[PDB]
Design a protein around this ligand. Structure first.
Ligand SMILES: CCNC(=O)N1CCN(C(C)=O)CC1
Ligand SMILES: CCNC(=O)N1CCN(C(C)=O)CC1
Ligand SMILES: [Cl-]
Ligand SMILES: [Mg+2]
Ligand SMILES: [Mg+2]
Ligand SMILES: [Mg+2]
Ligand SMILES: [Mg+2]
Lengths: 194, 194
C-alpha cells in the first residue's frame, strides 16, 4: 500500500545527510518524514557490519568480545559489538573479519551472516549485516591479540562471559558513566530469557 | 581522556538536527564528527522499545512484533513495538502505552533496561528496552484493540520465541522486508544460548 513519492535533499555533510521524504500513506494521503542517510553507501548491501564474536577456549566459558570507545554523537563512552562500515567492493564477511581484527586483534572464523537489518528505521535508512564469528582462542594467532586501530580510532577490548553477559554489562554501567548499545543489550537479554 | 569541545548546528528540522561535533582525541588532537540528534528529547532516553512475550497456556510462547512502512527505509520493517517517551512519561508507562496502541495487548512490566544507544557512530539516540509479559488467556487480551495514533499503520506479527530467528529469516525471504537489528540480535542470542 505505502511507498516513497519523492526525497528532497535538505542538508548534505561529508558523511551524513538530511532529507525530506514524501510518501503515500495507506489511506491514500500524501505525508512527509525527515530522514537521515549516510553519504558513503555505494553498491554495498548495507552500510556496515557489527560482529558477534564468540571467543572459545579450552576449559573456559565462552566469551562475547565487545569494544569500548568514545562516540562523539553520544558525547561519551559506549560498549558495542565490534563494527565498521563496509568498504567499496568488500563483502560483509570480509568487512567483519577485518574490523574484528582491527578493533580487537582477534582473527575469527565466519559462523553466520544476517541479511541487511535496520539500525533505527524511524530515523535513518542505515543498515548492517550482523556477522557471527567464532574466535579459536587456543590458536597461537589469538594468544596476544593487539588491536590495529586505524587513524583516529582508540578502542578498548572487553570480553565478557556469555553465561553472565547481562549482569556483567550491568556491573560495568554501575561503575562508570557509559552507555551500552541496544543490540548488545538485546543479545544479553535474550541470553537471560533463554 | 576524550570529550566534546563544541557543537556546531548544521541543519535543524522539526524532528531531527545535524551537528558538527568538535572533540578531543586521546592524543590531544582536535577532531570533528558529523552527528544526528532528535529535537524532541526533553526524558531518560528518546524512546522505548518493548519486548512483548505473549504467554498463552498450551501454546508456544511468542514474541509480538510489528510491521510498518518506514519512510527513511523506503520500505516495510519488522520491529519491536516502540515509540518516543512523552514529556513527563516514565519509560515503563511509555512501554505499556505503546504496546497497547500498536498491538492492542495489555501487558505487565518484567524488567527495564538503562538508556541504551541506537547507532552511536551516527546519533545520540537512546531507548529503554522494556520486557513485558502478556497474559494472552486474560479476557482483556482476547480480542486485542490496536489504537493507531494519527497516521500510524501497524500490522501485528507474533512469532514463536523458540524458533524466532528461523521465522524472521523466512519472512525476509518471502516478503521483501527488513528486520530490525535489535530484533535480529535478540533472535540470534535465543539460538546462541546455553
Ligand atoms: C504519520 C505518523 N507521524 C509520525 O509518527 N511522525 C514522526 C516524526 N516524523 C519525522 C521524523 O519526520 C514526522 C511524522
Ligand atoms: C579518523 C577517525 N574518525 C573517523 O573515522 N570519522 C568517522 C566518519 N566521520 C563522521 C561521521 O563525521 C568523520 C571521521
Ligand atoms: Cl520474560
Ligand atoms: Mg568500529
Ligand atoms: Mg574500525
Ligand atoms: Mg512506533
Ligand atoms: Mg503508537
Amino acid at each position: 500500500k505505502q511507498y516513497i513519492i519523492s526525497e528532497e535533499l535538505i542538508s548534505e555533510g561529508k558523511w551524513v545527510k538530511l532529507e525530506k521524504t514524501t510518501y503515500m500513506d495507506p489511506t491514500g494521503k500524501t505525508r512527509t518524514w525527515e530522514s537521515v542517510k549516510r553519504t558513503t553507501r555505494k553498491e554495498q548491501t548495507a552500510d556496515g557490519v557489527a560482529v558477534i564474536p564468540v571467543l572459545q577456549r579450552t576449559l573456559h566459558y565462552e566469551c562475547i568480545v565487545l569494544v569500548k570507545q568514545f562516540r562523539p554523537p553520544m558525547g561519551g563512552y559506549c560498549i558495542e559489538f565490534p563494527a565498521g562500515l563496509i568498504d567499496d567492493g568488500e563483502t560483509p564477511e570480509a568487512a567483519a573479519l577485518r574490523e574484528l581484527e582491527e578493533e580487537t586483534g582477534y582473527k575469527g572464523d565466519i559462523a553466520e551472516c544476517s541479511p541487511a537489518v535496520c539500525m533505527d528505521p524511524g530515523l535513518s535508512n542505515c543498515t548492517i549485516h550482523i556477522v557471527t564469528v567464532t574466535i579459536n582462542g587456543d590458536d597461537a594467532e589469538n594468544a596476544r591479540p593487539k588491536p590495529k586501530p586505524g587513524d583516529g580510532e582508540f578502542v578498548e577490548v572487553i570480553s565478557l562471559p556469555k553465561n553472565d553477559l547481562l549482569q556483567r554489562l550491568d556491573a560495568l554501567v554501575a561503575e562508570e558513566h557509559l552507555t551500552v548499545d541496544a543490540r548488545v543489550y538485546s543479545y544479553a537479554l535474550a541470553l537471560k530469557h533463554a
